[PDB]
């Protein structure tokens, strides 16, 4: 997992203003686990309009399928 | 940490319908919450869960994902 591409792809996602507290570590299984705090734009409900896009991108681009994404304004 | 008491308090929170993928390790907590679909959980649920986990369990390193 290239942490720079992960950061770039998070900030490249429509409706993402910023992020912090990105953690990416290996589970016992050796599979990637990710947590992140995302500040979404005021115009989008991120549950509907950002979360599915971040899930899709993290799976497709990084093979990360164990995700917990929190949104703040 | 009593996961049974964490479970009760999460489910006791207004706007919470269910949760899964609760993980607590050295304390850090992650969880997936299904909110009531009539509630945007970003203002009506998230701060409430964060203050409850702080008050009741001394847990402040939290990541809560709302979905479904
Ligand atoms: Ni945060
Ligand atoms: Ni889930």
What does this entry look like structurally?
Chain B: This is Metal cation efflux system protein CzcD. The structure is a homodimer. Chain A is 34% helix and 37% strand. With 73 residues, the first copy, chain A, is of the alpha+beta class. Chain A is elongated and about 40 Å long. Chain A has helices spanning 3-11, 46-49, 51-62, and strands at 16-26, 32-40, 66-72. Chain A has a three-stranded mixed β-sheet with strand order 1-2-3, covered by helices on one side. The first copy, chain A, has a single domain, classed as Alpha-Beta Plaits (2-Layer Sandwich), CATH 3.30.70.1350. Chain A binds chain B through residues 21, 35-37, 40, 45-47, 51, 67-73, and chain B through 21, 30-32, 35, 40-42, 46, 62-67. Bound molecules: nickel (II) ion (NI) (2 copies). One nickel (II) ion (NI) binds next to strand 1 of chain B.
SSE topology sketch:
Two copies of one chain form a homodimer.
Chain A: H1 3-11, E1 16-26, E2 32-40, H2 46-49, H3 51-62, E3 66-72
Parallel strand pairs in A: 2-3
Antiparallel strand pairs in A: 1-2
The complex binds nickel (II) ion (2 copies).
Family (chain B): Belongs to the cation diffusion facilitator (CDF) transporter (TC 2.A.4) family. SLC30A subfamily.
Organism (chain B): Cupriavidus metallidurans (strain ATCC 43123 / DSM 2839 / NBRC 102507 / CH34)
Protein name (chain B): Metal cation efflux system protein CzcD
């Amino acid at each position: 997992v290239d942490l720079a591409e992960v950061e770039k792809q998070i900030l490249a996602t429509p409706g993402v203003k910023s992020f912090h507290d990105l953690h990416i570590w290996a589970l016992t299984s050796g599979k990637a686990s990710l947590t992140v705090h995302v500040v979404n734009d005021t115009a989008v409900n991120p549950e509907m309009e950002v979360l599915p896009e971040l899930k899709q991108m993290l799976a497709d681009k990084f093979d990360i399928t164990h995700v917990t994404i929190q949104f703040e304004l």
